[PDB]
Amino acid sequence: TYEWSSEEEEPVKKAGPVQVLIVKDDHSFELDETALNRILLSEAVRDKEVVAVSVAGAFRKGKSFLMDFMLRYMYNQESVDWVGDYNEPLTGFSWRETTGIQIWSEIFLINKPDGKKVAVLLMDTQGTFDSQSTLRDSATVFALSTMISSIQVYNLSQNVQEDDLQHLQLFTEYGRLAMEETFLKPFQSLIFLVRDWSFPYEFSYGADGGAKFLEKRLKVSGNQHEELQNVRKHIHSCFTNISCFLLPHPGLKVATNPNFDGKLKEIDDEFIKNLKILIPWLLSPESLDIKEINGNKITCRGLVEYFKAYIKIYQGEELPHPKSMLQATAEANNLAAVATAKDTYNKKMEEICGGDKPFLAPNDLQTKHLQLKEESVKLFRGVKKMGGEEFSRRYLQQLESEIDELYIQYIKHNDSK
Numbered sequence: 001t002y003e004w005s006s007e008e009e010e011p012v013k014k015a016g017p018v019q020v021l022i023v024k025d026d027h028s029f030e031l032d033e034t035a036l037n038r039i040l041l042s043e044a045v046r047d048k049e050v051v052a053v054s055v056a057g058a059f060r061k062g063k064s065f066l067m068d069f070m071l072r073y074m075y076n077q078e079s080v081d082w083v084g085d086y087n088e089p090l091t092g093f094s095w096r097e098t099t100g101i102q103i104w105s106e107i108f109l110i111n112k113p114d115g116k117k118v119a120v121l122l123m124d125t126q127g128t129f130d131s132q133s134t135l136r137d138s139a140t141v142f143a144l145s146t147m148i149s150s151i152q153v154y155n156l157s158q159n160v161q162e163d164d165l166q167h168l169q170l171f172t173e174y175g176r177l178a179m180e181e182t183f184l185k186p187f188q189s190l191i192f193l194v195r196d197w198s199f200p201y202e203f204s205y206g207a208d209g210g211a212k213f214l215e216k217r218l219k220v221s222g223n224q225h226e227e228l229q230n231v232r233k234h235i236h237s238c239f240t241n242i243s244c245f246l247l248p249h250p251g252l253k254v255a256t257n258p259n260f261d262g263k264l265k266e267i268d269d270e271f272i273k274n275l276k277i278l279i280p281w282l283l284s285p286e287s288l289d290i291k292e293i294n295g296n297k298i299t300c301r302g303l304v305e306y307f308k309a310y311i312k313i314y315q316g317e318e319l320p321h322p323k324s325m326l327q328a329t330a331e332a333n334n335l336a337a338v339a340t341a342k343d344t345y346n347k348k349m350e351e352i353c354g355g356d357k358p359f360l361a362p363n364d365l366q367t368k369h370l371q372l373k374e375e376s377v378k379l380f381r382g383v384k385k386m387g388g389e390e391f392s393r394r395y396l397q398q399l400e401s402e403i404d405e406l407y408i409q410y411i412k413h414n415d416s417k
């Protein structure tokens with residue numbers, strides 16, 4: 001979908017959400033690999049370390065409203081009035097579904113304070129999120145988004161309830177297994193966003209009140225027991241960062257109205273004030289947490305391998321075993337190393353004999369190929385990979401065989417000139 005600009009005196013492609021995880025009507029789960037590759041394997045982002053921002057929680061609790069303002073920020077980080085004009089209707093940016101995961105088609109490229117340009121990915125994860133519902137659709141889409149995310153924004157209404165915390169059991173024992181095998185915490189940031197907070201006199205709006213409130217909800221106490229003692233004891237060994245932000249109610253007009261579409265000044269003022277703090281608190285350059293596993297920052301190319309590894313175990317009749325989750329993580333970590341190594345081979349061959357570049361003598365083509373293949377083998381060998389050397393051996397063999405396939409296609413192409 002293109003659209004006219006005249007700001008650029010030109011047509012421009014229209015960014016929008018893209019369905020990547022799909023819960024079908026028979027309750028089967030499909031990953032749209034094609035759609036995912038189109039977004040994450042493009043030349044501008046493929047090699048960039050990725051920040052995967054997920055917003056997840058129950059239907060109809062303001063996830064798409066909040067992501068509208070996330071888009072406002074990401075598109076106007078330079079301006080200090082990124083939020084828009086108050087006597088203006090909320091123009092410009094809109095997300096809006098069924099159970100699944102959508103991603104914003106445009107990957108944002110941001111400079112971290114130290115100067116590294118990273119890629120920011122935005123995800124919206126929806127389901128019923130009712131723990132008494134007897135079907136696993138919402139749990140699996142929530143587990144998957146969390147496994148993919150480096151910032152998971154858990155969007156809740158009014159409180160953190162025991163049943164909200166029970167969903168974190170999906171990653172409890174995995175996080176310990178992962179912990180014990182990599183000697184590092186498996187996840188980066190978890191954020192409890194409490195909407196419609198009504199008790200600012202007890203815990204103030206925003207991050208500081210949020211911290212104290214969460215600390216008191218997360219107390220272990222034998223009145224919970226029932227493995228919510230457990231989840232509370234283990235959540236910190238899963239996540240590098242855990243925090244909580246309390247947000248006022250937006251006012252009647254916003255609540256009672258699907259797509260309220262009015263002047264920003266009609267929204268409740270305290271809510272707008274805290275929303276303007278929330279978004280940069282989540283998404284500013286210093287705040288962006290790069291996806292990371294086994295001490296390796298993950299790229300847009302690499303992240304695709306985590307998508308593919310996880311869908312394998314989240315499909316089927318039931319949720320996966322915790323050891324299967326860890327197996328899937330180790331498999332993606334090795335395949336990400338394969339993709340990186342294969343990529344640098346591919347780019348360097350492309351420079352030597354792709355395009356209209358002149359014919360190459362076959363012996364010289366071969367000698368250049370062997371040198372580049374061996375460089376990528378050493379590159380792959382040097383990556384700190386999960387699973388141990390026997391586990392990784394089969395992935396080295398896959399890299400060698402995929403590089404060979406590339407070389408054959410270059411021979412074929414070089415034979416046409």
Ligand SMILES: Nc1nc2c(ncn2[C@@H]2O[C@H](COP(=O)(O)OP(=O)(O)O)[C@@H](O)[C@H]2O)c(=O)[nH]1
Pocket residue numbers: 058059060061062063064065066096195196248249250254255256257258259260
């Ligand atoms: N009570 C309440 N309603 C909200 C909030 N933010 C947005 N809404 C409204 O709730 C309705 C559904 O919101 P939506 O973003 O589509 O929810 P989603 O299904 O989680 O994405 C819309 O009319 C919004 O205007 C909030 O913080 N609190």
Ligand SMILES: [Mg+2]
Pocket residue numbers: 063064065095124126
């Ligand atoms: Mg939504």
